[PDB]
Ligand binder design. Structure first.
Ligand SMILES: CC(C)(COP(=O)(O)OP(=O)(O)OC[C@H]1O[C@@H](n2cnc3c(N)ncnc32)[C@H](O)[C@@H]1OP(=O)(O)O)[C@@H](O)C(=O)NCCC(=O)NCCS
Ligand SMILES: CC(C)(COP(=O)(O)OP(=O)(O)OC[C@H]1O[C@@H](n2cnc3c(N)ncnc32)[C@H](O)[C@@H]1OP(=O)(O)O)[C@@H](O)C(=O)NCCC(=O)NCCS
Ligand SMILES: [Cl-]
Lengths: 117, 115, 115, 116
């Protein structure tokens, strides 16, 4: 299933399986904030995308509540990967942990819950 | 801001501890469902959050939360309104309401570390 | 509510989509540092959250966030004021401000699934 | 010693650098009006492991915490929370706290502290 925003940000789906997904991307010049580092919205979009894909392997679902914890700043050129794993699957909701990693370092931690339509 | 420009976001208001940013959901901002991508709405809220916090001095985001209430389609005009909830020497927290045509689309809560 | 009674919490106000719960930090509500335990302040906010959301019918908490701004000592009078920020057919979200002697001690944000 | 932890009957099973395990049992005084463990009790348990694990690195105070609830628990249920360090910076640290009962994840807690 094509995701226009993911493609606009240059994010690619690497792997998809029941309740899990791995999305990859690279911080580009157009993803930076005024300080020369990756904008918080880009790293979130990346993690949120892995989250969207992993959650929808279970059926139609939409983002309900998500948390993003930032640990390390990134500059242009940095290769990034977001790996989503299912921590809970219920009939009406599901929760996923998404780790954002760059060169073996945990850049950010995303926690999200979807509402299963 | 490169990312803001790429997403077509515009700063409408900036004052001590507050900021308002606006944008429009374009075809390239939709997700796999054909609705406004959660990452786009977050980027909008995060932008106002960043601007508002920076009026107090340099700061880095630590933890942010986004709660989604209503979906939006292409063409929807959206706005993020950031207000300061707490300001301390080393941290600050802001509430950012994402609204479209009088409806609360999403609620963002973010905390920064003040440098 | 057994836990509210155990913590000595009192309901000061209850209306559709809102509630105010009050309590005092006792000696058995402190953490290892001698200040109000984060779990006590959360329990207070969570209780107002639970009461406010149940005014709309049966519901179960899904996700809650607690942001701490100021510490409190034994004897502090505290209040959790919950207000509905969003209501849908199957969900509801509340903002709960935890205050003591005119200061915003913490901010709670929670969402429930409406049964 | 933590007064609130003791009031709730919580016990420290293990404490090590950046880690902690706290256990307890849901008692009659921990229930909500619906007869299940109050959300404040489960959070208090997670928060306690979080506080202990974080303070092994030096004095620290909670900034922001998230609690996701998955399964309700009744009185008598044995529960434990394990706090693991996910990130350690000079000024802050973040921990993942899994709340479990009989091998099942009852809730997930995520917390960040400010290191004094
Ligand atoms: C989570 C969610 C599905 C829960 O909704 P619900 O309780 O099951 O059902 P409701 O019918 O009460 O819908 C709630 C609101 O969303 C709207 N909505 C829901 N589905 C819609 C759709 N397919 N098209 C247009 N509007 C829709 C409702 O009209 C209502 O807005 P309103 O109060 O202004 O009328 C809903 O809050 C929602 O859509 N949240 C946004 C999710 C989102 O866009 N996430 C990011 C992208 S994945
Ligand atoms: C994280 C925190 C320390 C950052 O503070 P800061 O920006 O570096 O500095 P500030 O001078 O602006 O903060 C002053 C407040 O913190 C207090 N404080 C500072 N050092 C303290 C300490 N060692 N022990 C107890 N309180 C302390 C002040 O007394 C004042 O609190 P008050 O208004 O209730 O009297 C602050 O936001 C805070 O105290 N948060 C509360 C965390 C909390 O209580 N969490 C739950 C229990 S662990
Ligand atoms: Cl959160």
């Amino acid at each position: 299933m094509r995701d226009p925003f993911m493609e606009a940000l240059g994010l690619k789906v690497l792997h998809l399986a029941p309740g899990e997904a791995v999305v990859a991307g690279e911080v580009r010049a157009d993803h930076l904030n005024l300080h020369g580092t990756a904008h918080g919205g880009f790293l979130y979009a990346l993690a949120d995308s892995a989250f969207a894909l992993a959650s929808n392997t279970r059926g139609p679902a939409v983002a309900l509540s998500c948390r993003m914890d930032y640990f390390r700043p990134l500059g242009a050129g940095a290769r990034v990967e977001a790996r989503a794993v299912e921590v809970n699957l219920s009939r009406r909701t599901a929760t996923y942990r998404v780790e954002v990693v760059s060169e073996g370092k945990l850049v950010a931690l995303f926690t999200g819950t979807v509402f299963r339509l």
